[PDB]
C-alpha cells in the first residue's frame, strides 16, 4: 500500500547475470528504507553522495534498482572510479554516482553441486562500458586480424564466460548478490519520498 517494491528486488528468487543486469524503475511511491537495514549478512552497504539516515528524509524524481550476481572478489569493482573485468565490461558506475551499493553473500541460493552455469560475465569487449550501459551481445570477439564471421576458434573467442558457482568454492569466488540504488533528481518534480 503506497510502498515501493523493494522486496521484489531484494527477495527475488533468481537474479540476473551481471552482463545482463536487471533494472527496476521505481517512482510514485513511499520508500521505506528501514526494511533495507534488516538483512545482517550485508557484505557491502556503501553509500556515495548521501547519508543512509537522510534517505528517509529526502525526495527524488526517480530511483533505479540494478540487481545482478558476481563473485565476492569483484564486489569492490561496484563503486565510482573502479577498474577490472566487471567495471569495464559488465557494469560501470559513474564517477559522480549518487546512490547506495548493497551486496551480500548468496552461496546458499546461487551455487549448486556440479556448478551453476547460468550466471555469466563478459570477458572480452572492444572498449570499456559507459556508465549504466548494458551490453548483451554474444558476437564473437575478434582478437586477431582474421575476421571471425561468427565462428569461434583461434583468435575468435566467445565473449561470455560462466562463473560455474560451486558451494565449496572459496569465499572470494562464491556468488554475491548486488543491488545498486541510484537516486535521480533531474529537471522534473520529485516522486519518491521517505516517511
Amino acid at each position, epitope marked *: 500500500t503506497n510502498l515501493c517494491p523493494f522486496d521484489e528486488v531484494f527477495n527475488a528468487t533468481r537474479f540476473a547475470s551481471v552482463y545482463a543486469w536487471n533494472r527496476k524503475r521505481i517512482s510514485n511511491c513511499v520508500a521505506d528504507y528501514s526494511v533495507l537495514y534488516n538483512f545482517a549478512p550485508f557484505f557491502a552497504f556503501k553509500c556515495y553522495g548521501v547519508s543512509p539516515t537522510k534517505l528517509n528524509d529526502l525526495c527524488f524524481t526517480n530511483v533505479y534498482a540494478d540487481s545482478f550476481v558476481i563473485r*565476492g572478489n569483484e564486489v569492490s569493482q561496484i563503486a565510482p572510479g573502479q577498474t577490472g573485468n566487471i567495471a569495464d565490461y559488465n557494469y560501470k558506475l559513474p564517477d559522480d554516482f549518487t546512490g547506495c551499493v548493497i551486496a551480500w553473500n548468496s552461496n546458499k541460493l546461487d551455487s549448486k553441486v556440479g556448478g551453476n552455469y547460468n550466471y555469466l560475465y563478459r570477458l572480452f569487449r572492444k572498449s570499456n562500458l559507459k556508465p549504466f550501459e548494458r551490453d548483451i551481445s554474444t558476437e564473437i570477439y575478434q582478437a586477431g586480424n582474421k575476421p571471425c564471421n561468427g565462428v569461434a576458434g583461434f583468435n575468435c573467442y566467445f565473449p561470455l564466460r560462466s562463473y560455474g558457482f560451486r558451494p*565449496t568454492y572459496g*569465499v572470494g569466488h562464491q556468488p554475491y548478490r548486488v543491488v545498486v540504488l541510484s537516486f535521480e533528481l533531474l529537471h522534473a518534480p520529485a516522486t519518491v519520498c521517505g516517511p
Partner: antibody, heavy 121, light 108 residues
Framework: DVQLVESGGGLVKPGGSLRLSCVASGFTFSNSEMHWVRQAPGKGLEWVSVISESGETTHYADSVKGRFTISRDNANNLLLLQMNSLRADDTAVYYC??????????????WGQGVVVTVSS | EIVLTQSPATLSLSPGEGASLSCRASQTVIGSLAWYQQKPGQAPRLLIYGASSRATGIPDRFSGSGSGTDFTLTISSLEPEDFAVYYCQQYGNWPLTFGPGTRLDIRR
C-alpha cells in the same frame, strides 16, 4: 613442510586491543584462503573470520563484527587479526588455519599452534 | 546458521572396538562436511573432508559417510592414540560452524 605460527596475543584489559599475526611458510600463501578460529578454555571450536586469497573478500562471525578486522600481507606471508573493544568473552586460544580448496581439500587442513588471548581486568 | 549436533557427547570404548560418531545438521549442508580430531593441548587435525574423503596421511581405519543433514565418522579399530575429542564442521554456509564435539575415552 607447511607451517603456521601465531603471535601477538597475551593479557589485555577489557576494552583494549590486540593485533594477532600469523606467519606462513611451506606453501603458496597468496593462493590460500585463510581463517581465524578460536577455542575458549574448556569449550569447543568457534569460527571467527575468513579472508580470501586476494584479500578482497572477508566475512566475520556476528559476535565480532564491527570490532575485529582480518587482513593479509601476501608479499610477507602475513595474516593479521586486529581485535578492538575486547571483552572477557573473547578469551580463547586463536588458531590461524587454511581452507585448501585450491588443492581440492575442502576443509581446514593446515592449523597453527594457536596463540593465547586473555581479556581480564 | 547451520547448527551441528554431535551424538553421543561421550563414548566409552575399549581398544580394538569400532567407533561410530554422529553429526546432525539443522538444515541441508550444501558445501563440505569435515571431521577433525583434537587432543588436549594440541591444535585440531583434519581427518575427513567432503564427508567421505580422507585427508592425506590419515590412517584408513578412519572413514566418513553421509549427506544432507546426517553424517557419520567411523573408526574400524580403535588404537590407543585414537581416544580424543572429535568435531564435525560445515563449509559453504555462513557462518562456518562446528559441532560441540564428542569425547572418546577408554572403557575399563
Amino acid at each position: 613442510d607447511v607451517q603456521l605460527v601465531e603471535s601477538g596475543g597475551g593479557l589485555v584489559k577489557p576494552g583494549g586491543s590486540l593485533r594477532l599475526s600469523c606467519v606462513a611458510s611451506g606453501f603458496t600463501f597468496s593462493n590460500s584462503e585463510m581463517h581465524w578460529v578460536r577455542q575458549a578454555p574448556g569449550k569447543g571450536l568457534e569460527w571467527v573470520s575468513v579472508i580470501s586469497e586476494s584479500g578482497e573478500t572477508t566475512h566475520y562471525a556476528d559476535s565480532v563484527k564491527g570490532r575485529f578486522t582480518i587482513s593479509r600481507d601476501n608479499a610477507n606471508n602475513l595474516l593479521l587479526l586486529q581485535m578492538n573493544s575486547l571483552r572477557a568473552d573473547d578469551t580463547a586460544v586463536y588458531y590461524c588455519t587454511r581452507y585448501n580448496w585450491n588443492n581440492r581439500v575442502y576443509a581446514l587442513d593446515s592449523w597453527g599452534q594457536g596463540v593465547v588471548v586473555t581479556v581480564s581486568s | 546458521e547451520i547448527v551441528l549436533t554431535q551424538s553421543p557427547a561421550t563414548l566409552s570404548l575399549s581398544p580394538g572396538e569400532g567407533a561410530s560418531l554422529s553429526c546432525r545438521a539443522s538444515q541441508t549442508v550444501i558445501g563440505s562436511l569435515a571431521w577433525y580430531q583434537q587432543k588436549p593441548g594440541q591444535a585440531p587435525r583434519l581427518l575427513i573432508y567432503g564427508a567421505s574423503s580422507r585427508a592425506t596421511g590419515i590412517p584408513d581405519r578412519f572413514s566418513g559417510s553421509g549427506s544432507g543433514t546426517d553424517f557419520t565418522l567411523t573408526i574400524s579399530s580403535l588404537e590407543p592414540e585414537d581416544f580424543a575429542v572429535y568435531y564435525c564442521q560445515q563449509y559453504g554456509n555462513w557462518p562456518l560452524t562446528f559441532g560441540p564435539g564428542t569425547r572418546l575415552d577408554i572403557r575399563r
